[PDB]
Curated annotation (Swiss-Prot), chain A:
This is T-cell surface glycoprotein CD4. Residues 1-100 form the Ig-like V-type domain. Changing residue 40 to Y: Increases the affinity for MHCII. It is found in: Cell membrane. It comes from Homo sapiens. Keywords: Adaptive immunity, Cell membrane, Disulfide bond, Glycoprotein, Host cell receptor for virus entry, Host-virus interaction, Immunity, Immunoglobulin domain, Lipoprotein, Membrane, Palmitate, Phosphoprotein, Receptor, Repeat, Signal, Transmembrane, Transmembrane helix.
């Protein structure tokens, strides 16, 4: 019963830890119980998943009794319950991946509107709190859009996306 | 080139350059009026419908030429034959090998009938001249035609059809002065080891 | 049965783009290699290129800047375009289902393993002529009779383009003993032919050759006399 | 009373072997010659319960051979210094296929004798220029060595049984009506190969398929054949064995001389018995758990080179052969088909042994044109977990933890103690 | 039918040793590797009768260690000629306590090469000037030796049996309701120590006291403890090994270089454990044969140095430690008090071995600051004959016959043969 | 369930020998030390049926000793080239009895070093002049060898019985009311002797006479005695070992030096025990198949020298002694007579081992005055077929097949395997 939030396009790590300090065999599987990763003694093995070109693990840690799964170049469709099967115990961790797309231009004109559509998994209920470069809180739901802007609102905008008591912040640049 | 064979005897048709490396000779046949069609590929493998009478030399010995052999030849094998050579030491060839026309000699000896005309008075009144030499009623379909101006062979202005099935024509373009200057002109037609000469004088 | 059928314009002018289509049935074009091949009159065939939907496509190096071969799976057909044409590009062009094969030996001869193609199913072909003339109609000269007890009597038809010319005699009331020889293409790029009848020498009937050339819309009756 | 799990084994082996070859050295020092029977005797009844994969005898042999490897590194094998930088060139002047070339011929500015003196020395490596060896490089060399497994008979000495379940069709965790009690095993060759069992020991009646947990695809499936499959791997690659002694503390080989120019390394599999054994594999899989499915095989899923290729040895040189030709077979639940297999291979010198203690290098190959004929005697698979809507099950190779190979050898062997 | 007293025993030993050290050589040449099991199986019933002091195995093991010693004297060890006279001098330039010295640095006119050539060669000795060796002296020296016990597993091989009384509380001649049938012992390290058992074996539950005849004070008392006592001996004395080879037959040692100014050789005892174990010894004596008495331990009664001191080895050099610290105790029938011990110790090269066949000299101590932490695992006592009017009993250390150390080892082992 | 005939054995031997002498080397390379405890425990009843001679284990030991001999021929022993021609002379200047020579000093121009260099080198042979070798002779010389049989304890390896018929009065094909089960035999020396068995073993109670089929005169009769007979063969013939190492490939000896003029080689038999053993043989023959007859002995019937003499080993040199003195009695069925026996002997270097692969030469005798005091511990006889009208039966010595010599020692042993 664990949740990890990931940002689209940035790497993430999931972690599986045993009570023994020995390198012992583990496997990582997705919610449909398809192999993503495993080890074979000290060798790394990848499994027939959509993550196959992008999954990895730090093998030095296996010899310490703990086993990550590392996913690079993360995409929204990588959101799933992921499990680890070590010591005849089943760790379950729910990865959710979020991202941000501005629908409005990279170069806005004077006195216009900003439109941001976040990317989220299907069957999810995201929550969002955005902020301006200076001192303006913005609240909203599925699509956040500020209908009125000023030329004082050029600069780096920060927006928090929140889910299951956890939060991440995204950064975008507006001129 | 041409190969001629009596029915039931073996024919051998050679095609292409001498081999340099290992090879895959492909062979094709073209019947008159028809598209080229495969006989053999991979030196001696035949598609469905080609009889085992056709066989090809393997891609074996270096410095030898490809040969198609056709045993027990019948009149329905009277066709053009082409090859396409793949060789491990040569590039892909994008032109086929030169075609060998197989003539099947069922019927012998029918000699031509030759007719030769002087130019028309209407053509001479047009300041032009053509001698017309017409050849018919012969078999097999192979003739060669040459002309003379008195006894000197004619090098320019001779035009000749391919015989088809089977008669032919040949023409000699002259000016009226070139026509009148010689005592006469000859049209010679050679067929199956003998030559007929027809003459016409101004 | 796999069936292939080529089509095209028939006559092209120099420097224009020849374009041909090859409609295919009995197989789907994705599942096969295709070649375009052509054969000039009296010459051996020439391979233009081969194409496959995978992109396993290579052309004759002489034609590489001028030629394109393509496949259209939605219409289930093969196509050819050849830019910049000259009379050297006159040929009957053919479309062929091409089959790939390999010669494989021991690994001591890995340098000698090679791939090859052969053509398995062909279409009937499309004649392409490249020339530079809109039209030319004939002249007709008679060939008067002179000797033999039966004698040849005829007409010479000179300098027309394109083919054909039709000749009948006596409006078709004379067909036995009649021979119209095929046209000679002369070095000028124009055609000429002759037609003769073989008739007795005693002379009661009138003889007329009826020469017609539809491309120039020209029809000439020529009476022939001794 | 019988009592289980004690970490006690005794090594027995020898006939004509002495020192020199590495398993021969291991038998000569760790073993003594065996007494070649044993009586075994099953006794009437005597239990119908056993488990093959919960056997710690497997871990003890695995750890012991790993420790014998470590002890083999103590005398001649060198931990440092000469992997630093490379100046290699390629033999290719004219190229197709963007081939590069796995063996690159190099020149190295090598320390020789006295202080800070160097000579140009021939050497060989596999990538390009500079690059060196990643964090560790332990060169094996040594004057008189070679590497081929030797049978090692393992015993239950002065007071233990090895229980031997003799059920020809034993489930793995199920009943066994004939347990016998044996002093030593018949002689296991300690083979180190992934995906396929090579040299091995065969099933007595029919092809046998085994798993610790067939429902769980993570656990490896072992396969044992009752008939072997021929596999023959030949490397025509040449070297002059040169070794230069210049200063007493340095010791180095000079490989790469001569010509021969061979394609990579290579292997053949004679497929007449591969069709029959794998046909019986898919028959047994349908008889066991895929009752009406189509059974596909697919090549390795992904991982390290030792995971993605058939990794095995032909003399302590390490070979990595392509697996696609073994696992390109969709067995539709109908009839079978003809023809034969040839396999690409590579040879490497470098292997990351043990853990990350260091890489070992068997670096001078001796002679050229060496061929290894072997039996494949079994397979190791990992199921690619599937669906039921697809009407197919897919299997990929497995293995990589050498304890699974020891479980194929010790499937009939468990050491237990008598109490009164 | 079981029948007793056969002299047919087999030897097993080896983990990681080869030649060089003397017991390691004896393991390598007299034994094969041990084969690590035994089942033992204490069958139900099967008598309640045994006598541990009536066991001819004890005499066999003892005779065999002496035989292997006699055999080690055959190759390197030197019977003659150079113990003749000593031109020793004294190191001291200012003295108190009339100390003399013990180890003295000496000078010798020594024979070298050819015929009658001599050089001044360093020597060390332990008396004064002149004096030499008495009747014999055999110098061990040798280029590759040391002397450390190794376990020797002794077996009754294929056919006969060792019967093992496992009873924790056994009276020596008394009943034993738990007797197992074993093939081999677990490995007995042959230690040659008097008065205290070093390394040995530890009792399973409590202090156990074993004596041949408790009423007869002439018989020795072997004490076994369930927990050991730390003893830590140290010799910071320095030497340079300096072997000289001169003529072909002569090969000599010239220990004596460098300095250290050490107080003899030394040892310490951790007294917390010595107090708990002797407090339990007097408690066990009170329960056994001393129902209401004050029990004193007193130092040795007289005799040779090997009999008056705790005499034992720490590398095959022979050591002698004063016993008074171990035995200055009067245990009243009440309680103990805290603190610690340090003991005087001395070392000799010269020891009498055998009967009177010859002295042996381990003449080259090599290097220095050599220390032997050891576990005391038993005590060898003898009772001093008392009265009842004195209201006390006294014990002194005792023994000296290594057969009695072998009875502490073979207290649970007796070979019997089996008839149908 | 007991089942017979398997081709497995195990070897045990060693106490003081190492390399050098050939059987010492065969124990060293085939066996390990022996483990001296056989309980045997004859179980009550357990069948009354045994045939000794139909034992394939005899052949196994015999053909394996022949392979061990062939292995000793591999390194030192020289198949070629030097035997071509001999320039021998006689030492006799005045002669009686026309004696020629069984041994002569010869010279040979032997190739020495480099190309086509030769020197006169001494040689010895056993014929005349020129003469050379017949198809082969292989020179055994080797720097460090000698030849004396060593006890080989042959064992049933692991869990199998050697079933042991212990019966003091067994018939060969008959019942045995005491059969026991033993792991290893007491050690059998591999003896190669004809007509008599030497070293051997002795009958437990009285002389035993055994044949495969006593009716069939073709089968040899083996005799085993309860008491040995003294035989003593001295050879004062002198040689000085002289090895000449001239070329890197050549290896050669010179012999024939020194003087002595011995009468051939000699042997003696103390008739005092020969008289009692054959006196008991004729009683035993009369009690078994000659109920009232005179029994006569006759000398060997003729053939090869090894078949006409008591031919045996005394040190790698092979000996041939005259049989007449052993076999010259007509044992009239009443009483016998005294005195003592001397036997003439000859010696050769040269023996026809195996089949016809090649002869082997123990070419350097070393020293002189070499004496073999031995015990005759068996006899090998053949009956000469006869009439009933002669009222006598005649026996001649027999043998020449070391399988019969192995049967005399393996007379109590049959390995069998065990099932429930």
């Amino acid at each position: 019963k664990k949740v990890v939030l990931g940002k689209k396009g940035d790497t993430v790590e999931l972690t599986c830890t045993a009570s023994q300090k020995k390198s012992i065999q583990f496997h990582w599987k997705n919610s449909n119980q398809i192999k993503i990763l495993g080890n074979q003694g000290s060798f790394l093995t990848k499994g027939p998943s959509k993550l196959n070109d992008r999954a990895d693990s730090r093998r030095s840690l296996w010899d310490q009794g703990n086993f990550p799964l590392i996913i690079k170049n993360l995409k929204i469709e990588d959101s799933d319950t992921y499990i680890c099967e070590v010591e005849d115990q089943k760790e379950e961790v729910q990865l959710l991946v979020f991202g941000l797309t501005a629908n409005s231009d990279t170069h806005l004109l004077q006195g216009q509107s900003l439109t941001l559509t976040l990317e989220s998994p299907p069957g999810s209920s995201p929550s969002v709190q955005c902020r301006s470069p200076r001192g303006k809180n913005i609240q909203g739901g599925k699509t956040l859009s500020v209908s009125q802007l000023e030329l004082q609102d050029s600069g780096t905008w920060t927006c928090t996306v929140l889910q299951n008591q956890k939060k991440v912040e995204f950064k975008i640049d507006i001129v | 080139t041409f190969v001629s064979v009596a029915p039931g005897q073996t024919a051998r048709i050679t095609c292409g350059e001498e081999s340099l490396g290992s090879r895959s000779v492909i062979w094709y046949q073209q019947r008159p009026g028809q598209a080229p069609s495969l006989i053999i590929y991979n030196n001696n493998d035949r598609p469905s419908g080609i009889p085992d009478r056709f066989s090809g030399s393997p891609g074996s010995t270096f410095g030898t030429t490809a040969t198609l052999t056709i045993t027990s030849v019948e009149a329905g094998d009277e066709a053009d034959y082409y090859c396409h050579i793949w060789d491990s030491r040569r590039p892909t060839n994008w032109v086929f090998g030169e075609g060998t026309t197989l003539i099947v000699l069922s019927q012998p000896k029918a000699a031509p009938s030759v007719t030769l005309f002087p130019p028309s008075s209407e053509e001479l009144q047009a300041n032009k001249a053509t001698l017309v030499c017409l050849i018919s009623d012969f078999y097999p379909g192979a003739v060669t035609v040459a002309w003379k101006a008195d006894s000197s062979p004619v090098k320019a202005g001779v035009e000749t059809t391919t015989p088809s099935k089977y008669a032919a024509s040949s023409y000699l373009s002259l000016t009226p002065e070139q026509w009148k200057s010689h005592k006469s002109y000859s049209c010679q037609v050679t067929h199956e080891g003998s030559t007929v000469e027809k003459t016409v004088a101004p | 049965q796999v069936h292939l059928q080529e089509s095209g314009p028939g006559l092209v002018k120099p420097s224009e783009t020849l374009s041909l289509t090859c409609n295919v049935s009995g197989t789907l074009v994705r599942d096969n290699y295709w070649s375009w091949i052509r054969q000039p009159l009296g010459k051996q065939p020439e391979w233009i290129g081969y194409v496959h939907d995978s992109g396993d496509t290579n052309y004759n190096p002489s034609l590489k800047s001028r030629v394109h071969l393509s496949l259209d799976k939605s219409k289930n057909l093969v196509s050819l375009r050849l830019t910049g044409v000259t009379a050297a590009d006159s040929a009957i062009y053919y479309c062929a289902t091409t089959k790939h094969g390999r010669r494989i030996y021991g690994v001591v001869a890995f340098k000698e393993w090679f791939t090859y193609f052969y053509m398995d199913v062909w279409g009937k072909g499309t004649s392409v002529t490249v020339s530079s003339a809109s039209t030319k109609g004939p002249s007709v000269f008679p060939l008067a009779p002179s000797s033999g007890g039966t004698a040849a009597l005829g007409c010479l038809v000179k300098d027309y383009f394109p083919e054909p010319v039709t000749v009948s005699w006596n409006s078709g009331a004379l067909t036995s003993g009649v021979h119209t020889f095929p046209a000679v293409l002369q070095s000028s790029g124009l055609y000429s032919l002759s037609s003769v009848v073989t008739v007795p020498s005693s002379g009661t009937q009138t003889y007329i050759c009826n020469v017609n050339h539809k491309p120039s819309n020209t029809k000439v009756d020529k009476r022939v006399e001794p | 009373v019988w009592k289980d799990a004690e970490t006690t084994l005794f090594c027995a082996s020898d006939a004509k072997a002495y020192e020199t070859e590495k398993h021969n050295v291991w038998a000569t020092h760790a073993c003594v010659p065996t007494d070649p029977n044993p009586q075994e005797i099953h006794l009437e009844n005597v239990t119908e319960e056993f488990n093959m994969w919960k056997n710690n005898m497997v871990e003890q042999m695995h750890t012991d051979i790993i420790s014998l490897w470590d002890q083999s590194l103590k005398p001649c094998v060198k931990l440092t210094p000469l992997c630093v930088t490379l100046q290699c060139t390629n033999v290719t002047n004219n190229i197709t296929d963007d081939m590069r070339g796995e063996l690159k011929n190099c020149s190295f500015n090598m320390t020789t004798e006295l202080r800070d003196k160097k000579q140009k020395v021939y050497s060989l490596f596999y990538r390009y220029r500079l690059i060196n060896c990643n964090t560790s490089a332990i060169t094996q060399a040594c004057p008189k060595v070679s590497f081929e497994p030797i049978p090692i008979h393992y015993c239950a000495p002065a007071g233990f049984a090895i229980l031997k379940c003799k059920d020809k069709k034993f489930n793995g965790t199920g009943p066994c009506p004939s347990v016998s009690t044996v002093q030593c095993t018949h002689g296991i060759k300690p083979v180190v190969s992934t995906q396929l069992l090579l040299n091995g020991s065969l099933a007595e009646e029919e092809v046998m398929i085994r798993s610790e947990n067939i429902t769980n695809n993570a656990k490896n499936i072992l396969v044992q054949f009752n008939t072997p499959v021929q596999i023959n791997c030949t490397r025509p690659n040449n070297n002059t064995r040169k070794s230069i002694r210049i200063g007493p503390g340095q010791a180095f080989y000079a490989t790469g001389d001569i010509i021969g120019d061979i394609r990579q390394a290579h292997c053949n599999v004679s497929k007449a018995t591969w069709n029959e054994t794998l046909g019986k594999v898919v028959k047994q899989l349908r008889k066991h758990f895929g009752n009406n499915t189509i059974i596909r095989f697919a090549n390795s899923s992904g991982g390290d080179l030792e995971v993605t290729t058939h990794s095995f040895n032909c003399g302590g040189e390490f070979f990595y052969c392509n697996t696609s030709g073994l696992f390109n077979s969709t067995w539709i639940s109908n009839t079978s088909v003809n023809d034969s297999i040839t396999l690409p291979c590579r040879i490497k010198q470098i292997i990351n042994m043990w853990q990350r203690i260091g890489q070992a290098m068997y670096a001078p190959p001796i002679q050229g044109v060496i061929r290894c004929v072997s039996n494949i005697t079994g397979l190791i698979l990992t199921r690619d977990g599937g669906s039921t809507n697809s009407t197919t099950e897919t299997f990929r190779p497995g293995g990589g933890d050498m304890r699974d190979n020891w479980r194929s050898e010790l499937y009939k062997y468990k050491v237990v103690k008598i109490e009164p």
